[PDB]
Amino acid sequence: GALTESQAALVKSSWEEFNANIPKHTHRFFILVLEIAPAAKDLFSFLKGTSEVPQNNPELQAHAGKVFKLVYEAAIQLEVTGVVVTDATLKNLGSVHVSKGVADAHFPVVKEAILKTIKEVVGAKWSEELNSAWTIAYDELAIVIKKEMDDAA
Ligand code: HEM
Ligand SMILES: [C-]#N
């Protein structure tokens, strides 16, 4: 689909819609995670010892916000430039996932959880053209982190 001027315009618009509600969209995101794979719970410091996903934990929120920002920035960078750029951050990202016990087969867990999360966020505006646009941008960014994990291992 490439990322036409028209597709980019579609991701920006839908990201703005997400940040518009972080405590919601972020706790939703962790539930769609534990739906797709329950075991994942022992991994997060702020989920261990708990029984349910904390709803107002600042550690949790600041964590999940950072995750979606990174996927959006990725899509514009693809329409403008044509690529996703690897920096210091994405590399420190890759280290911390390894310390914590995270693997690659974990990644379609977090993707579906994010496409389903954005399908929920845009509702009727949803198009093929948009699904195509966030699918392209996640896949392009995941390709880049998995790359830094394998490197931190
Ligand atoms: C494009 C895809 C992904 C993005 C953009 C992303 C982003 C992030 C960020 C920004 C942090 C916090 C880093 C810090 O500041 O110290 C982090 C932590 C973490 N990540 Fe991910 N991530 C991705 C995929 C995954 C996957 C597939 C898993 C596995 C379920 C995972 C599990 C974790 C865990 C356990 C931590 C530690 C949190 C703690 O215990 O405090 N991530 N991630
Ligand atoms: C990362 N979640």
| Residues 6+ positions from 148 with CB-CB distance below 8 Å | 86, 90, 91, 93, 94, 95
Cα of 125 from ligand 1 centre, angstroms: 29
Residues in the annotated binding site for heme b: 45, 66, 97, 100
Angstrom resolution of this structure: 2.0
Domain ranges of the chain: 1-153
Q: Cα–Cα distance between 9 and 44 in angstroms, integer?
A: 34
Region 1-153: CATH code: 1.10.490.10
**Residue 13 CA to chain centroid, in angstroms?**
16
User: Is 10 buried (19+), middle (13-18) or exposed (0-12) by CB count in 10 A?
Assistant: buried
Cα of 44 from ligand 2 centre, angstroms: 9
In short, whether 64's Cβ falls inside 6 Å of ligand 1 is: no
For residue 97, give the ligand nearest its CA.
Answer: 1
To test ligand 1's pocket by mutation, which of 69, 96, 115 has the most ligand atoms within 8 angstroms of CB?
Answer: 96
5 to 1, 18, 96: CA distances (angstroms): 11, 21, 35
